[PDB]
Amino acid sequence: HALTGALGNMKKFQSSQKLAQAAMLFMGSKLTTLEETKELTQIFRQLDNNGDGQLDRKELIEGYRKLMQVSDLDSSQIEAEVDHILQSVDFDRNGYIEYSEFVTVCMDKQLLLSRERLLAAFQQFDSDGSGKITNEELGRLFGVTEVDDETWHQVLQECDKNNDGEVDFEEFVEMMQKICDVKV
Ligand SMILES: [Ca+2]
Ligand SMILES: [Ca+2]
Ligand SMILES: [Ca+2]
Ligand SMILES: [Ca+2]
Ligand SMILES: [Mg+2]
């Protein structure tokens, strides 16, 4: 049943613009306690057949096949679910879902998006303490000096309500509320 819930949430999960992406992953990977995530750890271990810290394609396929236990058409439907997971949940594009990629996606967003976690992510990305996150600062998270215009446009359109080209904390929270459909 827990396995049903997490596979469900990985199904639903859709990609987002990069600031929201960097925020969720940072909160999920670094700001959560192992205590808070212990149920997700147990589920992850049930999927991780070879025990190496990451789910590959066969592991995810087996998770669905293990749940139902499967028609030739259910099989191709399962193939479709994993293809989706591997584009959306695999944030680093390495071909596996690491533990903390899995936790980020599968954790209750009401539980993840606490004001403390939001504000800690915020201040980590706002590296000069200016009170607003800029293009350069998003870029730093992805190892580059800036992000391209399309990337930044996507971010601004979602949350730059005052049209100043930067993301302040109030704007950051509203962005994350919309991405996760949650009131913070
Ligand atoms: Ca594995
Ligand atoms: Ca990955
Ligand atoms: Ca700043
Ligand atoms: Ca702004
Ligand atoms: Mg295992």
**Could you tell me the residue ranges of all domains in the chain?**
1-107, 108-184
CATH match for 1-107 among 3.40.50.1110, 1.10.238.10, 1.10.3720.10, 3.40.50.300? 1.10.238.10
- Cα(28)–Cα(113) distance, integer angstroms: 9
Q: Which ligand is nearest to the CA of 50?
A: 1
Residue 46 backbone phi and psi in degrees, to 5: -70, -35
Asked if 22 and 101 count as a contact pair (C-beta separation under 8 A), the reply is no
d(CA 184, ligand 3 centre) in Å: 22
Query: Ligand 2 centre from 54 Cα, in Å?
Result: 8
Residue numbers preceding breaks in the chain (C to N > 2.5 A)? 69
Q: Which residues are annotated as a binding site for Ca(2+)?
A: 48, 50, 52, 54, 59, 90, 92, 94, 96, 98, 101, 126, 128, 130, 132, 137, 160, 162, 164, 166, 171
Task: Find, among 166, 180, 183, the residue nearest to 115 by Cα.
Answer: 183
What fold, for 108-184?
Recoverin; domain 1 (1.10.238)
Distance CA 33, CA 22 (A): 18
Same fold flag, 1-107 and 108-184: yes
For the chain, the first-to-last Cα distance in angstroms comes to 27
- SS3 (DSSP) at 127: coil
Resolution in A: 2.0
- Determine the length of the chain: 184
Experimental method: X-ray
CB neighbours of residue 111 within 10 Å: 12
Q: Which of 114, 105, 104 is nearest to 183 (CA)?
A: 114
Query: HSE-up of 19 (CA within 13 Å, CB side)?
Result: 36
Annotated binding site for Mg(2+): 45, 48, 50, 52, 54, 92, 96, 98, 101
